[PDB]
Amino acid sequence: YCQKWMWTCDSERKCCKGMVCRLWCKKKLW
Numbered sequence: 400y401c402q403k404w405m406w407t408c409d410s411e412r413k414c415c416k417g418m419v420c421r422l423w424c425k426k427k428l429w
Contacts, residue, residue: 401415407423408414414424 402408402412402418402420402424403415404418404424404426406412406414408420414420417427418424419427
């Protein structure tokens with residue numbers, strides 16, 4: 400699974416595209 404908006408990511412766990420990978424998955428505003 401890709402990490403959803405209410406999820407978080409890691410070096411392995413990636414957030415779903417459209418969001419940015421960070422401590423938590425954050426929507427790409429920029």
